[model samples]
Target: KEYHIDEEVGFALPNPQENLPDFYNDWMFIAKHLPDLIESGQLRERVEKLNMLSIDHLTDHKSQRLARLVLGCITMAYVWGKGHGDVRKVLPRNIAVPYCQLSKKLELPPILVYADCVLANWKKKDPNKPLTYENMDVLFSFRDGDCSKGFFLVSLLVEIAAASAIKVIPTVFKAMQMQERDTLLKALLEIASCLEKALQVFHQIHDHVNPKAFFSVLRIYLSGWKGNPQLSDGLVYEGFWEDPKEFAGGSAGQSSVFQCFDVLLGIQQTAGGGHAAQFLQDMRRYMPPAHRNFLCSLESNPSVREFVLSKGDAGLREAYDACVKALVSLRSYHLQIVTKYILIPASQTGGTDLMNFLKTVRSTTEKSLLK
Candidate 1:
């Protein structure tokens, strides 16, 4: 693989805050008012107005932490205040307005923008295109071999895995445009190979993080609130209130890459199964709004599946087999993570039913690959 490099790399969001002290002072002011704002239902108005502010440029480590804190709060509000099911319009326009603007300015979803975007130096030759393979390579290559840096690396891998999963969509689109059957088949194989590589990176997480520390210090950030009876067998996230219904509504704090891949490959049925079926159905809400719409559009216009079918039985069967292998590889790895990290630790005080929830997710994902 040839790696391309650009001599002049720059920040994705061009505008940097000119007044650093004022920015910090203002964030502190807003932070103090947050709980009250939420209670008074005035959070949306205040947050929306704050949309005009840009993150202070990363001049020092302290500033970076500040940016992370702000983004995290904004994200929690987005999911929690967004409403419940049909009546789910609870997030005030004030909150949504700035929350979204900040997300775009950061060039990522709120939950991930800090770790996934800011922390990684994902340089690109074509700055317009989002960072891809090499950028991922740079991130996955990091390993300090201890609990603190170790678990942090695991979190980063999860973020990487989620981003890599979604990236396959464009790859599929590019593959379908190839007119030759052999080329298309090659593209399919390449995709399977890419997914396998991502799994390998996910595998590294097990090697790095201290399991006890992961369960204690780190896992809390990755979690959503856990009060829903439906998710009683699920993990309790100390971060925010888990809407009994949404239960990991943010797609287990992952990007919608894998789900979108299932759609492109024509594996998961939109209408089928029960809760298992509905789980896949609800994955759409977790994706960034842009990707949700893009993934939804691809369902109706399945470039990969349509092209493979057009090539007849040999092509269709081959494509199906590749997908099955990929999906199997993913779930098998998932089960391993769940068993070692989640299930075995159940006797411990911080234990959670998160493993059970993951098992259900894996089960549904595997079933979708079946004929």
Candidate 2:
């Protein structure tokens, strides 16, 4: 019935166990050099040559996620290493089998995802200091170097900033039971304030990541076998699946931070019909099981928006609207991030599916504001 957070890292795994048990050091070594290997067209070659390792040693959740994080990065590198030079469809068993096994155990897809990229992909430069842009660093990256590092850590910071909001979710549930207006108002303001802070950290993507690389160099690695035209049939996880199996790609849509806010305010994304709506439905599967289940758990409570309006308390109504607006602010700003990072760089652009989908999501959030 309760949501999860690591306190120190929020939804991100605490300490992420930077080093897996020694037997899996091979993955750690290759993951660390993904950028060089991909650019030199050596990743698939390297992965193909190595003996497949088992996930039995990855006993704990932290170690399993770390293993998923490393292997997931290596999978992306193996597939996209050739970039335009090749379109490799089948995943070799050496990487594919263990990746599939880890994915099964972790309840994640066998591809790099938000949980892998942001939630489980960081360490502190100064283990002594708190999590901050200055103190944080990425565990893995692409050839774009700092931009790649910046993209993942910036997303991590966004999650860290949302911890305050995620923590107060229970207060709203408790208040809803007794119609405790004061407690509910206090919770709404805290959620709004934390979301506002999250948006600030989200904006630092401009300071850290370069839009050009985000569009051209890095994004392709995040693309999944599903819905992508080139890989329309899904990927073959050699020796694992007899038929091609599809999985949604890594994206912010799968992020628990955004999903938590949507669930709290009753953002009815599924009301709209189209790829955006269906895309979101599938995006839930990409999130870690416990995180997604938290969203399900919150929905069991009555609608916050409906309760606030029915109460007819002006102060409560305003506070409720403020939470929706804060969520709107973040979702609205997300469109601009996509524009700069994806729109302008492509030279001919939403006026594309991504833009239309993003546009759809914003309107959905805006609609959630109280009357």
Candidate 3:
């Protein structure tokens, strides 16, 4: 239940966004865009509840509403930031997190971590005056929570780079003198890689989506760090991207859409189900190696290898455990609403082909779950 800390909080009935489907029209055009949107509204509601529940859970009361609101707004903005070029990479703390100090105290899930990374990067690119968590406040009046698309991890990588520049880069800047810039830049690259990894973490925990398909997307991003000039080059660079100032060393590094395309290819054969399978097939045509060889090569990196094996095992176990302990609390929150809001109303009107509808819904859910 720790992850579901605010499961009991209410957001009126059935999200008044009324047009949730069309409101997401722009998003429906792209496949990758769905997760952020799915999460934004649900997560906003969940976090709001968790903040209040933290008091009951013996957590701190810095639980101010504005701080959470700031966090929510900034987090949501990043999910909407993909592929817009450098502008998409940088984020402002003012728009992201006015209460970043809480980050250390709270056990944020992957999404929040990603959002933090984005804000942190922006802080470095454009320093916030007197940056302090205390500037954040909580709002009790805010209601009708529904914006499930929170920040994605690439955006977070930017944030972390920013935070490091302000807090750690100066030290690197001081020790190496002029060489400090390179050192800071190296750390930023590391942050970018870490953010890439975190995105995988998200893919694993949320079963409704496939984690493997994103490998290609991530690979494309990694190529930027590798410093390969030819967008067509699929291999790692002779040196990092900014080596010899080819890309200009800095903590605010960015990946190209081409790189993202490559990374998206990496996830192709993984999971062997869902849209990931389609990706794998598409990539196989262009892939030089045999399937087994390709998979083997993919697992060569210790970090990626470990993640490939461990992510799902860990996430599913944790979610299973959390759900078991909190089932009653969860049921109490929604049990009544199910019968009162959905079942009864449906029963009263003969409910539009119960058998077929349930079957159809189940099939769709199965496809997503398989994802």
Candidate 4:
């Protein structure tokens, strides 16, 4: 799939056509009432009543994403709506079959991921206002209030922050052909700058989203069938598959921006069992297909790191290493967030030792510096 760098909107899907066609009004209706449905403990019943909607009605990319977001919310509610104790081991046929079809069509896992929860989850609050975090609201939310909106919007802000860097892959590729180290340095530094802004945008979540609620409330719905003990055997997608399936939940780690940076900067890690790198690669399955395709295209090409290394130019290498360092700093900052949000909260609270995975990820980033 060819990547389009829209001069106006970078990665966040220009407007994402928040409303789907009337053919999917039921989905839209279910999505809109998610908060109330879940709050009253009626989400499961309401979803169970949905007719088996044919996925063929959804024809376009934006509609498909809306399908994902709507179904994703419903799935979250269906599985864990009545709190953790009432976790349903089997999703009813109405949702499972259509969700599986939608998942296959999008080349993503059946569970919610960053693509559904964040990338395609937000819209501008005011049509006339600039698309900043303050002006954005979630297109769909799990539970009512600002926690869900804050969580998704903050991530959206990070994606927006990465847009400039995202468009630079081709620039760096073109500049290398011209033997233009100067152009390469400029583009790489721009990447570093965007990452810095991404880090800043990430920090804003702390102020807006209550960390306690992030873990206790919002994070649970974003969870997938994999790794959680409640659904140890995995979720049975009734009428879709004979056996149960497991997929990782939506996490900030699944963002294409970070993975794309890993590809371009040539950050490699061992894909051993239970390894952080292995887990990251698995997360890619949850990304939007074209976004993953973009990463594959970059990986298929000559790496920017090797290009800089072959020249052996001190300033150019420094600029390149600066980009790597910037990534390391951003990753390190992510560890701090995990320590606060995931680690400490879990201690106060199913989750495993996330610190090790997170620390290893940052440590790996530190090792990516061009020697």
Candidate 5:
């Protein structure tokens, strides 16, 4: 298995011939030779070739895998292209420019866009618009050839639910200005409304695809270097490695919405202080510095939760409590789907690291949130 190694960054790229789709194979080829391709400035040409792949080939089950890899890697690459906390011009303009445009064409995963782009690049001039769900609605609208169904639609919904939850931040921020109970309650309920739609969509499409087939096949490309001692027990995603200590492995479960919920609820004790906390904290390193800092700022300045709790008015407190409870249930429902669809189905299989990984993830998620 031929691969590329970046000694400076301690990354070892995976083989591109791993029985995957041609688009993914092409992605790996580019991933393996990113520096040389960028130096010669042919990265754009190669990516264009990838983009020219038949739409038919880019929208099947195999194509969904390509979508995940492309979304995860390119977003991660865009963030850490110049190393963590430093957003310098490391990637050539030819590659950087089109990759972003292409992501929009494919409707890049909502979680990445919400966390990496929207939250990170917030415009104080127009707060309400950027934080609303209007822009993200397209993620749910697009379908592969079949309007009734899509290869990545289920995964897309999963991300949308998380993104909807995250929208609570800006929604609340905007509401705080009015300082009216009706306004605050309306804003909070809007968050609930978005999440409700996300949940309904998940229930509708989760079983449309076979769990084992989807999870098993996708896991191959999502794997990391478990053997790397420098990372300890952390996983490092290929084409996105910034440091040995950073685990950039592809995971849809690392949504920052839950963290925001924690901040808004004024829950400090269970904010994660062990290895779980370390994992959650380290995940931020994969995000752009500006976006990561905004979340940090929210954590430190929990205006939403503090405001509700401090208000002497009983009505405001009740409304706030209801919102928090609703969010908890929303997250709980997602956990239920994980058990019934992903965990249970994968449990029946053996000889796959994916199953073990899912089991660990289920446990981590359950323990972290079920508190």
Candidate 6:
């Protein structure tokens, strides 16, 4: 009852003195001060360089075994972290020591939090073991394991970045706790921020090397994707719009263009004896019945023949008629340009000039449609 200092504890505020390192108090600490650290442009650049070097070091030393472990942590941290905490069971512990050490030595993930997440998760999940997710079921259903390797690699890389964030933050707190909690938070943010930067750099590297590369790469992939008998079934029935994260499908107007060109490319290949017949037959199914006979005359399929002779579905024939008309414009352009204009050297005279033209094509090639 006597107002003694020890007895007067009605309310006491948390003393700022009761603190961790200046950097790693909490998220805000890092958020506030990371800018100045990043703006210390040289230091930030050094960190970025160190990250690149650390990747090389990790690759040489732990790349074979630990890469998967690290990535496993990252992947779970990302996808699974959104829902259940089960991913942590798969991470590694002992191997994580060297990993955290490397991250720190390079002045990367100073704290092992993110790295440990990866290690712990890797210990939890075995790479030799099969993945268990419903998304994978859909993916495997469509891809049937063809592009799964590439997709898995992409997932693996993302997981590493997630772990990298975990690693940088707690250590940054320890490193900067005394300095300023806000500063520590900022450092954590910088780690996350660099991820997008790294992706941009990767894209630039790709573009600088090839100039017209991605579009061309997409062309080849799409060409085979549209026409290749193996990949076609997946293309037709499989919904490209299924994933919001992935922009595979376009708006209604855009899809018409995309699908139109898709069929046209199939036509070109089929025409050049690159298997256009199969496509023509399949496309006729989507055409109006009245036009079926005309399209059937172009190609000799029984369904097409009967549709033409016996009056196949008029609507399907109409659609086929329209598709054929659309393709005619593209075909005419092909003749007008490569066949008509550009003088070819005798060395390049004989073999498949048209197919070669398709190979050298661009986004504008599609634009040239009906022009």
Best by lDDT: 2
Please give, for residues 51-161, the per-residue lDDT of candidate 2 as tens digits.
789988777888888888889888877876757747778888888899998889878888899988888888889879988888988788867543777788888888888
lDDT of 5 by residue, 76-118 (tens): 4333332223232233333343343444444442123333222
TM-score of 5: 0.50
Which parts of model 1 have CA positions greater than 4 angstroms off? 1-22, 25-152, 158-179, 226-253, 306-310, 349-364, 367-371
Candidate 3 accuracy as lDDT? 0.27
lDDT of 4 by residue, 306-355 (tens): 88889878887887888788788887888788778877877781245567
Using lDDT as the measure, what is the rank order of every candidate, best first?
2, 4, 1, 5, 6, 3
**Once superposed on the true structure, which residue ranges of model 5 sit more than 4 Å away at CA?**
1-152, 158-171, 174-179, 226-248, 269-272, 300-302, 349-371
Off by over 4 Å in 3: 1-66, 74-88, 93-101, 109-371
Give candidate 4 regions above 4 Å deviation.
4-9, 270-274, 349-352
Candidate 2, backbone clash total: 0
> For residue 93, what is the lDDT in candidate 6?
29
Q: Per-prediction TM-score, please? A: 0.57, 0.95, 0.19, 0.94, 0.50, 0.18
Error of 2 at 238 (Å): 0.7
Q: Residue by residue across 43-129, what tens digits does model 1's lDDT show?
A: 555555653444444456334434544545444543444222212224443334344445455344434332332233122335465
Q: How far is 332's C-alpha from truth in model 2 (Å)?
A: 1.3
Query: Residues 235-324, candidate 3, lDDT per residue (tens digit)?
Result: 211222221211111111121111122221222223445543343333332211222233343344232212223445543333223322
Summed backbone clashes in each candidate are: 8, 0, 41, 0, 0, 53
RMSD of each: 10.3, 1.8, 22.3, 2.0, 14.3, 27.0
Over the stretch 1-371, how does candidate 6's per-residue lDDT look in tens digits?
11101111110110111122322222122222322432342322222232111233333322322332332222222222222121122213222334444443333321212222221112213335443222121111011122322322222233333333323433443533354534544553454353343243222222222223222221222121222333333222112122111112110111112232333223333233333334333443322222334333323312221232243345333433443343344334434333322233212343475445444333323333321
Sorting all predicted structures by TM-score, with the top scorer first, yields 2, 4, 1, 5, 3, 6
